[PDB]
């Protein structure tokens, strides 16, 4: 998703209070603000090198990561600039002294810093409410391939 047009909305997309003076001629054009989210999390290169905009991007945006931090694997990429992860986990029934498989499906807004794919585990930091569903934000991507290369052409 994202991945072109930068301007595609009827609204002109820009970072708040980051001003490019027209009279002062710059060869970089855009002056692009960022930070590092903290909590020992790398603000990735593409957040800086990128041309993108989104204000829900915890590195270039106005949302701050605090509270829980969660691991889980991506089951759905179908939404633009957000995704749903399945964090499974086991539940202990005291009577039977056993465990039963459970899961909870967490929608989380993926900044357009990351290329996320289905099957990739992802680390996710908690943030302020973003959409109806999403209280969490993609932070680190733990799987760069997930078998992608082992599928290969004939010879």
């Amino acid at each position: 998703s994202t991945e072109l047009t930068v301007q595609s909305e009827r609204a002109f997309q820009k970072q708040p209070h980051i001003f490019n003076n027209p009279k002062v001629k710059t060869s970089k054009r855009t002056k692009r603000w960022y930070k590092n989210a903290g909590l020992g999390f790398k603000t990735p290169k593409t957040a800086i090198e990128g041309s993108y905009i989104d204000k829900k991007c915890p590195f270039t945006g106005l949302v701050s990561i605090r509270g829980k931090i969660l691991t889980g694997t991506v089951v759905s990429t179908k939404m633009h600039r957000t995704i749903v992860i399945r964090r499974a986990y086991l539940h202990y029934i005291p009577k039977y002294n056993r465990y039963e498989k459970r899961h909870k499906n967490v929608p989380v807004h993926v900044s357009p810093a990351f290329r996320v794919q289905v099957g990739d585990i992802v680390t996710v930091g908690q943030c302020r409410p973003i959409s109806k569903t999403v209280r969490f934000n993609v932070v680190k991507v733990s799987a760069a391939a997930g078998k992608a290369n082992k599928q290969f052409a004939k010879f």
Binding site: K147, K150, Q151, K154, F155
Partner: protein, 150 residues
């Protein structure tokens, strides 16, 4: 034991304790790896070849005399088929069964085995897809099976 029957039989090959062996074999990896690939050139299967080099020539087990198995060697030599041979003869068999069925649909026991055979086919593919020897989405298709045998 024996998924699709009640068959309890134990029939197999008993592999020897000697990992290097025999001590009576001359020639070399060069000689057999060359010997392997000429029969792969001819088109024999790792099952057909390993028997051939067992009986005619002097290979007890080709896994030993060369540090690699038969198929791994064929793979590195570009002579590997696109689908493994157990899967091949699985699909190649069901192609003949359903072929007999189009002749006689009156034959129920044939219609029955065709289920078991095709069950096994779908099981192999599922594994082969898990381990990525076949692309994800590889599926056994009825009418497209006659074209994968020949």
């Amino acid at each position: 034991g024996r998924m699709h029957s009640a068959g309890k039989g134990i029939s197999s090959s008993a592999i020897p304790y000697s990992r290097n062996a025999p001590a009576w074999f001359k020639l070399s990896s060069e000689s057999v790896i060359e010997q392997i690939v000429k029969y792969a050139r001819k088109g024999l299967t790792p099952s057909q070849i390993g028997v051939l080099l067992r009986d005619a020539h002097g290979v007890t087990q080709a896994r030993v005399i060369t540090g690699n198995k038969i198929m791994r060697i064929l793979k590195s030599n570009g002579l590997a088929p696109e689908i493994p041979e157990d899967l091949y003869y699985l699909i190649k068999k069901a192609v003949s069964v359903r072929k007999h069925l189009e002749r006689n649909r009156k034959d129920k026991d044939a219609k029955f085995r065709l289920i078991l055979i095709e069950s096994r086919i779908h099981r192999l593919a599922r594994y082969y897809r898990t381990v990525a020897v076949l692309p994800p989405n590889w599926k056994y298709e009825s009418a497209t099976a006659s074209a994968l045998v020949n």
